[model samples]
Target chain A: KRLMVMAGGTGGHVFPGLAVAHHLMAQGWQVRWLGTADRMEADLVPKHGIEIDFIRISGLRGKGIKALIAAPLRIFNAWRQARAIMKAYKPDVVLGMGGYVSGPGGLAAWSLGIPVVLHEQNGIAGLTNKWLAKIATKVMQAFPGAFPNAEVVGNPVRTDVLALPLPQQRLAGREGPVRVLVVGGSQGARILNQTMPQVAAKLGDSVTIWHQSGKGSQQSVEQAYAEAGQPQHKVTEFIDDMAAAYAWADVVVCRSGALTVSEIAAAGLPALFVPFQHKDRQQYWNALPLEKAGAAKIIEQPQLSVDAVANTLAGWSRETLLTMAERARAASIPDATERVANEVSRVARAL
Target chain B: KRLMVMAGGTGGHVFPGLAVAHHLMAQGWQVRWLGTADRMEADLVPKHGIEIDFIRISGLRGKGIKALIAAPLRIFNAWRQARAIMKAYKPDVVLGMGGYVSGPGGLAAWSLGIPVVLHEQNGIAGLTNKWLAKIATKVMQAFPGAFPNAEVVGNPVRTDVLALPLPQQRLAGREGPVRVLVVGGSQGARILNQTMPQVAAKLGDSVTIWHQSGKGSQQSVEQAYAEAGQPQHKVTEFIDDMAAAYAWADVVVCRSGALTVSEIAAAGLPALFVPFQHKDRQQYWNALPLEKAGAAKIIEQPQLSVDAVANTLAGWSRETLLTMAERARAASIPDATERVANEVSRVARAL
Candidate 1:
């Protein structure tokens, strides 16, 4: 069986698709990705050993007159190219991952009579998934009740997370130092980077920090840490080895992106989830399960301050951290990849 | 009374500040401009014969960790410069007109216990204005009831729009040609460039087109028009002399930017407004008054087609256009500049 994956433009969109692709490939299904040439998919997909097809696409929503005029024209051209690709590849099912980048390729799939499988990674459905829902034969959801007729299959996470040790085993290594991992997730959280470093001095040498401040903020984060008396930290733009990073951590502090919540939970890592401040409470919703289960604590970005974080962490004992870590392990849905793959197989064979 | 004006980042923000600056100068009030160094304000403000004080400032909201990290550091540094400028100038009140550039300069005034006045150009108040309104003495609005405590003073437009000939007199000179003016407003509209040229072939040579497709879009629009078998239309990226453009126009087709709506109405030109399709309803709200008053007709960007525009215009008689033109003139708030200036004077004098 052949499955065409339309994903990327963001880590939130692509990583989930990649998780499912890994399963599909293992089951003797050939998978090829469709994405914009310049986005995260360009580098990330190729590194993962997946074959890719590129289309030159840009967002048209809310752009200037020139962009508005060029967008639909560009989208149609991309759709034509996608149709041509479909004709050549002859994939049985097209998986529209998320975002506007998936829109054209998904439309091509629908138009050409290929069964379109849609996935909404967020608790709140995005515009692309919502529009694609009308023609989508099956819609898979990460968050429960995200969309009508969406089967509640938890978001697929990285393979390395499945192999992680229990929270008790992970926490055993932290003897003299508490390993505190601070990340801004894939897009990077400016709030976390800024506030975390300011609290670095207050967190003291007892806490060793691993900060992924994003590429754009690597210098600023490094500089801020230097100003705060080092405080025993490793500052990097990105952490490629999440499995090792999770192994080293007593607790994690990061943005509540749907992928981040799922991956962290599956790794049995205790976390403090700070939801991005925006009109949509999508991130807030993603963190809700972990928060309710005592696996994570929520911080609305606006109310987050250095002093508040410092005081909160300073108050938490190692015993409390391990307990939260246990709850995080309990919240994990280890079989999510297989669940989604099972449905994808059903959708592929049904029509 | 002296006033410090903070407006920049775009022509939309800077132009309104200039209009108010012109009035304050005429009223024997000393005015100094505060803006970021290398932005549009550098050229636009200085060319207006107004002295400008530079601040190094950028927006921090919803940005990356590095940008979030750097935002406050930059704002305070800009504030130090703003304080220095305030100490030297000693303006009575500071007018922060639109967007992020105004934020730091406005805060500088509020910090020093100097009164801050805010002007919102959009029907929905932007992020900057929404935040600044907390400390602002009084907030002036372009559209009625935009915000709590919003004074509907209307937006200040170009001074020349007040002196333009009536649309009836303006349209009388079009013996053979309809003399249609197509504008994308400040940045240019892509939809107008693509759809208008295609519609030109169907409309025939009865309508003469003056199209402003924006700078990057000029070549594409020119090519589109040539392909439509009507190469006689005038195409430029910008119409510097909008007074002449208004006087020459029998009918106008343009984006429904807040400033564009105000300017065209002041010139008594009947228009077809194509609001930008976006997550926010800012553009749609700006065009609503004209549409409700029968001064303009609306074509939403998604539903827009070349044939639809051609049919709408083809169905309209000269008498109907004249009636709409009169309705446009009726919709014009010609005293907007005076009204805004009056409030600014009162705020500057109080305390």
Candidate 2:
């Protein structure tokens, strides 16, 4: 009847975990969140009415020598802290939504003889999940083939987004210009913020834009839009109601984080994915299936420019956009929140 | 009723572990050993007639990037393997004897709610012991101030060494040549192999030597001594009867590995220690206290030479050697094996 959800750092990991936690709570299970104090989850999890505990931890990848040298003691200390928390909480099961914080939390739960269920919300498994999968009771993956012996349950989207009816005729026979929604995920993307104003200026009233510029960039983004003489636009630091925003959009332009991709699919909207560039190119792989299914388009970061994105969007006819919207609906698992919640319950009840 | 001893790699860890294991076995406790299959313990523990199970593992310090990259998976797999072994064996307590193999084994035991007791033999704790010390039920140390909150129980030497009577006034009224025992520990030290012959050739008629040249160097060492024309010496691959050798000798010349240091102290023989050279200079610190107490002399590896060693020995009068031998007796803990065995039994019986 009790569970601990372990996740932190970004919305990609936190949102799906929150969605599952909410579902479990609705079924009368007590749920708590385990995360680092300084990450986004510290603020976000408590805001969702889930009690949260903190553990001091950080990622080890690509760290400097000083951090690497201090890693063993830091890791051991964190694991001990996590174990103490778990002993007090006495959770029936632990759900690890993959991140560095999950590594210690899940490990502590496993060490205490509690069943650990992991959710990896990426096309390629993260480092923490890859190590934990060996000992986890069950691994739930958002993307197929991401992990061996993992069940592809899809990334959990908020109930509001999942409640939005499929946009089957979203762009059918519309006389108004195409509606464009731009978001850069929970922390927002700098590249998208800077380039979208130029993209809007080039389109020149052919499209109406709603840009979520993240924190601290709202002023600059609004100034750029005003300077570009684009009156049919709005910029905000964050969008609280994604359901309303998705309902108003004909197509979305954003980064291809696993959660973002899943939400767009669940909302049944076409998208242009500009994945974050990295050596692993994990985001690109996350969007590849959607692109292949004709539900989305991909743009590499190096080739990303105002004109390139503008020209690409300028070519989308209402008919083609509607078709893409239908394809996007096909890519979504509308009941993913329930699916993941059920798995967590099954593991806990088995105990 | 059951205990698992975790140690491997070298005699420094395995011998103290074996000493304690033998002590516990004689007291009617069921004992098993957990070690690495590829390390020295695989052959040595079985040869001692102890039941041993192995987990594949290695040290992580200063490893290459490829090994570091593979470290997480390897460590996780090893922990899982160790957990499986512990589940089947169900030990009441795990005694870690300070090596890489002990990390996984001790962690597995701790995770299963089995108590873990660690024995750190060196004056400076190794990486594995330092990490495990935080969770260990008790930490037993050979040298004082080696670890915080650790009990200085002293290093356990074999029963034969423990049984040897103190050589009080060993050099008194002796007109015969001073008998010197030269050893390089389990695998032998190459530096001692090459230098001691020259040292013997220099000290000619004033001293006689019994050299344990280690395996594969017998013929070459004998040739060196024959070439030096110092026929008042014996060379063999190993000295199995250390008690007899210690009883016959007035002085010991060897490395300051914790086990060897403990054995010489228990045997009550004055020593000249040439510590192994390394960045940590841990062996030098291991020998420093004995030198400070006037029980032994230390020659740094860079300062070690035939004439330097020969002259030091040639300068020692019988009265000075006797005083040093008495000081060595003062430095030893004669009941260390029984002490370690008692602690292990107390922990196991508490279960």
Candidate 3:
């Protein structure tokens, strides 16, 4: 059976689909991708040996009247584009991982009487997923209660993350140094990249900080370490090998986006989540399951203080962090890739 | 203090704002309205002696790419129009009742540091209200839990509805024909206008039908009754006095929109709710409270048959309907106008 996957827009939206793509291919399903041009997916999906088709689409959120009035026509145009792709590809099933492109992709499938499966990778479903849920044959959710009748199918993660065994010993201790990874969100990195090195400086030799400031911020971040005279901290513009980065860290300080949480959970690392202020603290809600399970803690951006965050990490004993890491691993759905694959197969078989 | 009211699009949206407008005016506050030229609001708001200004805006629900792409510019343009309106009106507070215009109206207020008060008149909050709740100084809900801090203020109904005395004993019953009011949605009148006549013909002398088919469907509705040899039914294109209509109805058949439910609840009548099929069963959810309380029954459009619906009505005994009416009254929140007005005053007073 073949599956058409729609996983466009930001890294958080696309990476989960890519992870699923890898697993689906490994399971011998022919997987073709649909995405928008000039997005993160365009560069990333091709590298995974997947054939991704491009379509025109835009997000419904944060738009004004000209866009609103013009939206239906463009959406229709995108659907037409999608329909053409479907006619040629003849995939057995369509899987939509949330993004603007997902709307047209799933809609084209539904219009053609093909089963559509939607995957929501957030605590609160985005606009695309919310409307698509009604028409979808089966909805898979990373976090529950985002949509009615959605089955819990924890987020798909890369093979490397899936293969990594749980850490054998304490990631940090009184004798051994604590390994901390600070990953900033794409939207706002300045505050985090600037503040974290100073935090590392204040924490002294007990902590080894590894900072990923994302694109275009590496210079400033490196400058921050120099200014702080905390050259022991490692800084990079991006981390190409996230599995290794995650493996090296005892604790993580990062934006609590859907994908980040999934990876953190999969890696079984204790986390301090500083959710970006957008869509009314949706990211904050995204990290709640871990927080509730004693796997993570939330530090809202408005209340975030550099030294305060540093001191909290410093105060955590080795035993407490190890316990938190164990809790994190317990909360993870280790079989998400297979579970989502089962759903895809289920939908495809029904068709 | 002066207040600005944003009430655009359908009667479901504008009428509640009008209800609040009447209350605000009586309390000696200057109230100016915001709406679109081509909608129901243009004629209705002016007739109420309220000054309404037009802005370029349309709903974000169920649209495609060209419209979504064009939406931002139109919304931005509308926001600019609202900003200009805010400048000229210089209102102390901005009150957004519902609809597309509310986004620009509340946004203009927020940008200018004016307090924004939003009202959601549904079981669940719409897109505009959901986002506006973040920046709004006070959020008022018809049902509950759209926002963490949103206060349950119920839905505002016309003052005529509020003042309507307990509907005089049996507008129809065992002694005479049962009085049945059939109200169609603004979307279309054909389904209801055409169907009810056949139902009335089936019921024969047991019922008197008052059908409001809305504009453009009245001629065909009249034809249906004439063809059925049932000219006793009153057919109209529009309803001028809803309070009288309620007092006349022992049983009502209508779309379960927010406003219709509020009026039916306030008038203390047993109803058969035939919700319009749109927005993923939003209208069905809107009628749930009454349905759960045994105040109403739902006849989904897909399964609706004239004879079947008529038989259900015929099957109901007067005692059961009377008990249902009492339960409807129990579910009624008659003081919604005063409560909403109080919130308006509270926000305005603080400003």
Candidate 4:
């Protein structure tokens, strides 16, 4: 049976779907995707070894001329794109990883006698995924909520990263100081990068700092570390293999993008999360649940200080550290790649 | 009795709700709109002399990190906003036209002991509108279908628009050349703009051309008409009052936006639609039922040219023109607003 997975726009929506696609390919099934011609699909899909089909889709912002003229175009575009895909592929099943791409893709699949499985990887389900869940054969949840025939399966993590050994115990081996790793995604945070050198200075010799300055910020960042070089300090331009990085670090410090949450949880590592404070602080909400569970701590973006970071690291005790590791395990879903693959295959073959 | 007239975000959604707001205000009832801060509500509501308790609500995109990250803050904000509004106003009834803003707004109103009514304006309902319909006290339909127990009232065109005389005999009186109007929502086809000018040039003094250039291209468009110096041509920046525009045009040219289609039918004007010719031509599919009923003509953008438009317009004789006008009149349900409003008031007041 032919299998299809779909999503839209941002890295958050596209990456998890790609993770599922990678797993399906491992199972030797022909996998493809349907999405909007948004930047994520146009730029990310080609690089990921997946084929993508686009819909001329956009969202209805509010009540006005924009929505008036755009509404029919969007609705008509959805129906037409959906019809063409259904007719051409005749896919047995479809999976929606949450985006506008999934709304029409799952709807078209269901309309054409295919089964659909929709994943709502949010505490408050997204509009596209919410609509898909109405007709989905199985609706999966990432947060605490209702889903029709739903499963509370967390979002998938990269397989290689999930295989990193947390080993039921982590050790600093009485060697100088505990190692702290700082990671921001591909487009590193402006606030985090600017604040790090001060943070490293405060931690000083008690904790060794390993900072992965995203992409091009490395030279200047490395220079700053060199300017105040102590013997145990390290700064890198990039760390491509997160699994290896996790094995090398005693503690993790990062922002809470869902994939980042997934990676950290899978590694069962204690983390200090400073979610980006947007216009209304939505991103910070992403970190709240994990922080409440004690696996991670929230450092308000404005208060993420060099002194504050040093004080927190200094206060970490062996028992508190062990409890956080336990909390990470409790928060994480192990072997997520396999769980996602099973769910995806179940939907793809259902029809 | 306490009355609520809830309209969706778009004018199609909000205008109908506004009619109810107008009627209730005239009757000396307090009506607070549960809506998003859309441009229409922002501009039109205060102008119409009603109060709007605009909630901080928006549609969540896909169920990925971006959406997941955005949802909680919006939900909490909307909930807090709703709670404050409800406590202060104590609304008796809540209403929605259609859209996600209405979902949270209506629910907030309902929680405060207000009953909700959802009025659907399209034959194929929106995902948000459909869900609202399921929860609304009574679902009001624009066309034939609403819910199992839905009321089949006509959609709410501005009352004066519904009162316009059908233009059948005017076209019948023309024994010379058929006058045709063309329109569409998206930035009108580059070809349609080019072709319609040529079609008008080819058809000569027999047809008068009127065009609605969208928001951005308006100034240059009016300048183009000045350059062409054709006494038979008129180009307006935007048709703020579509009802007035329809009264003068013998045949209307427009796109197949649901609102545009419904408004044309309500006006009983024969049309030549330039359905967006993108991809699978879903716009064409949407206009098919009206085309099948002979009320309008649908043209794909690629096939659109001076010749194709000229030929189709020339093909219409007096008899065919009259026939199409009758079909449009028959297709319209001119009292949908009142029916939807009445039901909404009835349900909301019951609380």
Model 1 clash pairs are A65-B189, A65-B190, A66-B190, A190-B65
Q: After superposition, how far is residue A230 of candidate 3 from its true place, in Å?
A: 3.0
Worst 10 residues of 1 chain B by lDDT: B60-69
In Å, residue A336's CA in model 1 sits off its true spot by 84
Which of the numbered candidates is closest to the native, going by highest TM-score? 2
RMSD of each: 30.6, 34.5, 33.2, 32.9
lDDT of 2: 0.82
| lDDT tens digits, residue span A136-157, model 1 | 8998887675786688777777
Error of 4 at A324 (Å): 1.0
> How high is each candidate's TM-score?
0.46, 0.47, 0.46, 0.46
lDDT of 2 at A79: 80
Give stretches of model 1 more than 4 Å off: A1-351, B58-81, B171-177, B185-188, B214-223, B236-238
Greater TM-score among 1 and 2 belongs to: 2
Q: What is the lDDT of residue B76 in candidate 4?
A: 60
Model 2 TM-score relative to the real fold: 0.47
The lowest-lDDT stretch of 10 consecutive residues in candidate 2 chain B is: B60-69
lDDT of each: 0.79, 0.82, 0.78, 0.66
Predicted candidate 4 versus true structure: per-residue lDDT over A1-351, tens digit per residue: 577778777777777777777777877877777876755687788788877777765555533223423477666667678869778876667878776667667767777878887766655566677666778888777645434446777777777777776636444332335557889767666666666677777655456566777888866775665445331244555666677667656678888876687678778778888777665454565566577788878898688787777678788765676678778867887655577678767666552
Summed over model 4, clashes come to 18
Q: What's the CA error at residue B49 for candidate 3, in Å?
A: 91
Candidate 2 reference-contact recovery:
0.00
Model 4 spans > 4 angstroms off:
A58-70, A143-149, A172-175, A226-232, A279-282, A348-351, B1-351
Supply candidate 1's per-residue lDDT for A275: 87
Residue pairs in clash, model 2: none
User: How far is A148's C-alpha from truth in model 1 (Å)?
Assistant: 93
